[PDB]
Structure formats: C-alpha cells, structure tokens
Ligand binder design. Structure first.
Ligand SMILES: Nc1ccn([C@@H]2O[C@H](COP(=O)(O)O)[C@@H](O)[C@H]2O)c(=O)n1
Ligand SMILES: [Zn+2]
Ligand SMILES: [Zn+2]
Ligand SMILES: [Zn+2]
Length: 248
C-alpha cells in the first residue's frame, strides 16, 4: 500500500489489541519518542528508499510474485535466501516475540511486522513476476497515467479524498471479515500471500482496456477497502498472539 493504506491497517489493528499486547506495543513504541503504531506503519518503505544497506537488502521483503505458479508458494522457488514477504514476515514475527531481545530490537521487528501484514494483503504484492507486481503494467486512470501496482497501492484509495480520520470509520463500518480461529505466525503468511495472489488473478483485476476510470473504481475499490480491513484484523490477531500471552 501507500502510506495511508499502511497507517489505516495499523489504526484498525491498534483498536483490537488485547490489554497484554497493547501494553507491550506501547513499551516498544515508547523507546522512540512520539512513535505510534500508525506513524511506524510506512517506515519500511522509507527504509527501502533512504538506507543503501538494510533498505536495499530488505526491498524483496515487501512482495512475493507467485501468480505464474497459480498462487502456489514454494520457498526454494520464490524465496531461496528468504528475501520475500512470506519468509520475512515469519522471521520478524519470531524476532518480535523474543523476550530475550532489547526493546530497540523488538521495536524494529514491530515496524517490519506492521508494514508487511499490510503489504501481504495488497493483491499486487503477490502477483506476476512478469510485470513486477503490475509496476510494468502501465494504464490510464481518468485523465492521468499510472500503473496497476500504484492503482492498488493508493490510486483507488485516493479517490475517497479522506484523511485517516475520515477513512478509518468507513473501514470499521464494513461487515466483519471471517478470520482464521487462531493466529499461526509461521503458517499464515503463506496463506495470506496465496489469498492476495488469487485476487490479482480474478477476472477483470487486469483490465482488457488501456483506459479505465469510474467503472473499475466502483468494482475494485470495495475489494481494496475489504483487504485494508482484513489486513488490520489479521495484524491485531497476530500481535495479540505474539505479544498477548506469557502464562504457562
Ligand atoms: N514511483 C514510486 C512508487 C512507489 N514509491 C514509494 O513506495 C511506497 C509503496 O511501497 P510498497 O509497494 O512496498 O507498498 C509508496 O508509498 C511510495 O512511498 C515511490 O516513492 N515512488
Ligand atoms: Zn505498501
Ligand atoms: Zn506496493
Ligand atoms: Zn512496502
């Protein structure tokens, strides 16, 4: 997603935190003055843009292109050295849950987990290697050029012309999505990447015309918005599992 989609995922999640996970999240955020779950949600994209070390190393962690394999993820094929969103989200979830680590180390893992639960729910982040997740699929949206990747990251969301205070209660108003009964931090990333890939392959998501506008927005903006709400509920369930339990 763009920066607003990332913040909205975090905002949906923050409201659903159990008291134990909320206390631990606030403890980690407090190590970075005035940080919130929303303000850190875009951080991994600015790290990618600005840090020639970890930023360059982590660029692959934002996606996994599995549509040419009909949305059947296989790590040795799509992800050999672990540089894809499925393996990165698994590892950063393990690091976040590691109570032996410093609050600074665990905040860094929280920043990756908040971002990548957002990205793994963006259909074009699990799409075709051929066109780099739609980045190479140029199209005209209204009287402006864009690409299919950007259209899903932010183009359709921007048509609401809402700041987060306007957009968040619209996402919260939707019918509740059906979640898995429990978070499995090691298995759910693959399930989520596959589900996002199946949306990228749905009839009409790749349009049959170079020029699109209101009809595309009317059909697919609700799907993008359903995916933000789903991402937020899935992020809260993950944080509630990873940070929410200690007894026994
Ligand atoms: N042409 C582009 C495309 C994306 N971007 C950045 O990448 C972000 C999206 O990253 P993800 O695809 O990982 O979500 C945008 O919010 C923006 O900051 C950019 O800065 N210039
Ligand atoms: Zn994103
Ligand atoms: Zn993107
Ligand atoms: Zn990203």
């Amino acid at each position: 997603w763009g920066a607003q989609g990332h913040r909205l995922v975090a905002e949906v999640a923050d409201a659903r935190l159990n008291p134990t996970a909320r206390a631990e999240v606030d403890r980690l955020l407090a190590t970075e003055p005035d940080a919130t779950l929303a303000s850190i949600a875009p951080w991994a994209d600015q790290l990618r843009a600005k840090d020639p070390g970890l930023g360059r190393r982590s660029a692959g962690w934002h996606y996994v292109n599995i549509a040419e394999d009909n949305c059947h993820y296989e790590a040795p094929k799509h992800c050999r050295n672990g540089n894809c969103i499925v393996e990165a989200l698994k590892a950063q979830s393990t690091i976040l849950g590691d109570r032996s680590l410093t609050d600074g180390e665990r905040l860094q893992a929280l920043k990756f987990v908040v971002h990548l639960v957002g990205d793994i729910h963006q259909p074009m982040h699990a799409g075709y290697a051929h066109d780099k997740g739609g980045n190479d699929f140029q199209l005209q949206f209204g009287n402006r050029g864009t690409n299919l990747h950007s259209l899903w990251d932010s183009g359709m969301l921007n048509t609401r012309k809402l700041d987060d205070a306007g957009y968040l209660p619209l996402l919260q108003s939707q019918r509740a999505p059906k979640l898995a009964r429990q978070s499995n931090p090691q298995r759910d990333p693959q399930t989520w990447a596959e589900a996002s890939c199946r949306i990228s392959m749905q009839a009409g998501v790749y349009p049959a015309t170079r020029k699109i506008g209101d009809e595309y927005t009317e059909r697919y903006r609700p799907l993008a918005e359903a995916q933000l709400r789903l991402a937020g509920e899935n992020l809260a369930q993950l944080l509630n599992r990873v940070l929410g339990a200690r007894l026994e």
